[PDB]
């Protein structure tokens, strides 16, 4: 026999058998062949044969395992795999602060999270004083992993139950193993259509390969640790996820467990910086910062305290980075602004709906806050002035035609460039006329009016009359995976999330920024009253309209490229009206539906209260909300609030013609259009424009000036979610520096 190892380049000058399974085990002596698992782990040819040979006592145990590993995995069941999976002793790190030595557990002991959580040397003299096995240090040599035969496979991963559709060994888990918020679906399932904020359990994302190139050859270990980390975060999103919390949940045999534990911290911090975990409204204070002291030296001025500014500020602050927020208005929130004065209900003057809760940051934050959302039902009757609910067949007939018009638009645009763009509204019109011409079919006036409702609904979505919006690019964002699942009413209002994000941050109100100078060593920021601020980096999150107006003086000036992109998007607008009543007059006719539609008498009036929203899902209080979109936004600019209220009440008395309607006892009418520091509702792509505009606006300048806000998120434009995510995005970029 020999004392040398098979593996070329192995530094084991004295192989010893860890298995001792054969009554003939060679121990530290001679054997025909030493089989190598790592630089510190070998088993002799006798113990090899003990399992591998049919006439040996350990053959049963190896064939049974070989069967489970077949009905469960995609990797070949080799004896070395069996060894690493079944016989290799566990290692656990002493938890005594001043020791922290790694210890080998005896071969019969099965390591559990509870054992790892509290382990100290000797747990069955000063056991902590016994020297650490010399093999432990070796593990932190980069070549150590390179001479590992097989990649680690985790046991009982917290991620396991979420991945029952994959081969465990394809996602870093062991084939021989084995009440979450329904909105948490972090992992793509096999054969799934795209959905927002999902990762593949079996493939590294582009940014991941960028940060951890050493895993491009074999991503097994990374995926297992990343998947575990996400599972742990979503299992409990109310606490910072730390390495200490993860380590006990890393269960794998062998010295490799030490390498896994050493990697988890790197991956944790990357996940945190990028905003995948330890995020949302989670708050962390002095001596709880989520990123190492290495990121802390730096400073930032954030301009704007809406969802985007507050997202970035929350992230950076939690990171340990010095942040100051400058807000123009006497309040935070921006286009989030809730009226809490209504009886028993919260009514948003701005945002209040969550579009697609699955994996939505907003859904996470509701979880963290213990907030419940109301899922909208599907029903939305199209009610005519005055009284008549639209015939179901007429309803279906015109829905079909409306969407058929969209199909042909999407067909027309396929070969058109930005230089040939035409307005969506004009395109739809032409296609419609040319269809009635082609086919002698003729629609009634009502059928035409129902079509107008649908058109109005497009205008609400874009915040613009359709003759302004791009036929080519109106729905550009759907090129990317969107947020799936329920649309909900955020009944408590977005303001609760806003408050929570801002709590304890350094925020200066009534401080409108007028000048940003990034020509010197650090950014000089000056307010409209001449007050000076300075920091290493600046993030601007002001609304698109304000960038278009040029209310902030940039030195040096924004690029011509940026200006073209800024002007190629539209500062979309809608206004809201809310009305309180003495009683729920609509219950008889509406029958519990979350909303009801209003068939337009004419094309010109189509955006005047097209949809009415019942603002109490408990059906107890009497508040209606409605919207003003498209052409009707203009028609209302010279009308005072009372006049708008009069037209809304006139509309309601028409919609409910065959009954009486009580007077409203309290109401508001929004004027976002003329709020000086906002001047809009949400962005859209103007004719001639491209989705790429969102990317261009998003582009930092010289890693010194950064941009966020709903109009900088190409994937998720318009929304609080999108604005929030753009802030997380920029916080990651800023923290990397």
């Amino acid at each position: 026999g020999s004392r040398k190892c098979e593996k070329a380049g192995c530094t084991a000058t004295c192989p010893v058998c860890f298995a001792s399974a054969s009554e003939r085990c060679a121990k530290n002596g001679y054997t025909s062949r030493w089989y190598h698992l790592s630089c510190g782990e070998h088993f002799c040819n006798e113990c090899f044969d003990h399992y591998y040979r049919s006439h040996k006592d350990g053959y049963d145990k190896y064939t049974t395992w070989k069967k489970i590993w077949t009905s469960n995995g995609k990797t070949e069941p080799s004896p070395k795999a069996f060894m690493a999976d079944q016989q290799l002793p566990y290692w656990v790190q002493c938890t005594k602060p001043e020791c922290r030595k790694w210890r080998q557990l005896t071969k019969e002991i099965q390591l559990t999270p509870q054992i790892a959580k509290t382990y100290r040397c000797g747990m069955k003299s000063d056991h902590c004083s016994l020297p650490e096995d010399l093999r432990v240090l070796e593990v932190s040599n980069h070549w150590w992993y390179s001479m590992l035969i097989l990649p680690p496979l985790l046991k009982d991963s917290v991620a396991a139950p979420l991945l029952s559709a994959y081969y465990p060994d394809c996602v870093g888990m062991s084939p021989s193993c084995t009440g979450m918020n329904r909105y948490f679906q972090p992992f793509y399932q096999p054969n799934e259509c795209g959905k927002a904020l999902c990762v593949r359990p079996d493939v590294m994302e582009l940014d991941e390969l960028y940060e951890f190139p050493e895993y491009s050859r074999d991503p097994t270990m990374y995926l297992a640790l990343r998947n575990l980390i996400l599972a742990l975060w979503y299992t409990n999103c109310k606490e910072a996820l730390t390495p200490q919390k993860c380590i006990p949940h890393i269960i794998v045999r062998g010295l490799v467990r030490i390498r896994c534990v050493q990697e988890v911290e790197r991956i944790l911090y990357f996940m945190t910086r990028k905003g995948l975990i330890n995020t949302g409204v989670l708050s962390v204070g002095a001596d709880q910062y989520l990123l190492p002291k290495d990121y802390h030296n730096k400073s930032v001025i954030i301009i704007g305290a809406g969802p985007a500014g507050l997202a970035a500020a929350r992230q950076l602050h939690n990171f340990g980075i010095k942040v100051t927020v400058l807000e123009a208005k006497d309040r935070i929130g921006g286009r989030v602004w809730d009226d809490k004065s209504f009886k028993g209900v919260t009514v948003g003057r701005g945002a209040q709906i969550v579009n697609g809760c699955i994996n939505n940051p907003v859904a996470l934050m509701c979880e963290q806050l213990g907030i419940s959302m109301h899922k909208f039902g599907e029903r939305c009757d199209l009610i005519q002035e005055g009284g008549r609910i639209t015939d179901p067949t007429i309803d279906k007939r015109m829905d079909f035609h409306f969407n058929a018009l969209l199909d042909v638009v999407s067909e027309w645009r396929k070969d058109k460039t930005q230089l040939q763009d035409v307005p969506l509204g004009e395109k739809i019109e032409e296609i419609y006329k040319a269809f009635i011409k082609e086919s002698g079919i003729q629609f009634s006036e009502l059928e035409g009016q129902v079509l107008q409702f649908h058109l109005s609904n497009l205008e609400y979505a874009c915040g613009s009359n359709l003759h302004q919006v791009s036929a080519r690019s109106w729905d550009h964002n759907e090129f990317f995976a969107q947020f799936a699942g329920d649309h909900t009413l955020l009944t408590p209002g977005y303001s609760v999330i806003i408050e929570k994000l801002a709590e304890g941050l350094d925020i200066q109100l009534k401080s409108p920024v007028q000048c940003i100078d990034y020509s010197g060593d650090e950014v000089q920021v000056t307010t409209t009253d001449g007050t000076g601020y300075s920091a290493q980096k600046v993030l601007v999150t002001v609304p698109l309209a304000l960038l278009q107006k040029g209310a902030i003086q940039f030195n040096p000036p924004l690029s011509e490229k940026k200006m073209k992109a800024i002007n190629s998007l539209g500062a979309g607008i809608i206004e809201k009206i809310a009305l309180q009543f003495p009683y729920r007059f609509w219950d008889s006719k509406v029958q519990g539906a979350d909303f009801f539609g209003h068939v337009p008498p004419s094309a010109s009036k189509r955006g005047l209260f097209a949809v009415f929203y019942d603002m109490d899902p408990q059906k107890k209080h009497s508040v209606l909300m409605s919207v003003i979109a498209g052409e009707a936004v203009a028609s209302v600019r010279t009308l005072d609030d009372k006049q708008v209220l009069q037209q809304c009440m006139a509309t309601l008395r028409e919609l409910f013609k065959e009954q009486e309607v009580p007077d409203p006892t309290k109401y508001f009418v929004t004027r976002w259009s003329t709020d000086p520091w906002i001047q809009m509702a949400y962005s859209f792509v103007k004719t001639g424009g491209s989705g790429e505009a969102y990317d261009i606006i998003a582009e930092d300048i010289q890693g010194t000036v950064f941009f966020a806000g709903e109009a900088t998120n190409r994937h998720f434009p318009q929304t609080v979610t999108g604005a929030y995510l753009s802030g997380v995005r920029e916080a990651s970029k800023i923290a990397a520096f």
Binding site: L206, G275, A481
Partner: peptide
């Protein structure tokens, strides 16, 4: 396939 990528992990 750009469609599916995680938004926060494709910022290159």
């Amino acid at each position: 396939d750009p469609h599916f990528h995680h938004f926060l992990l494709s910022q290159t």
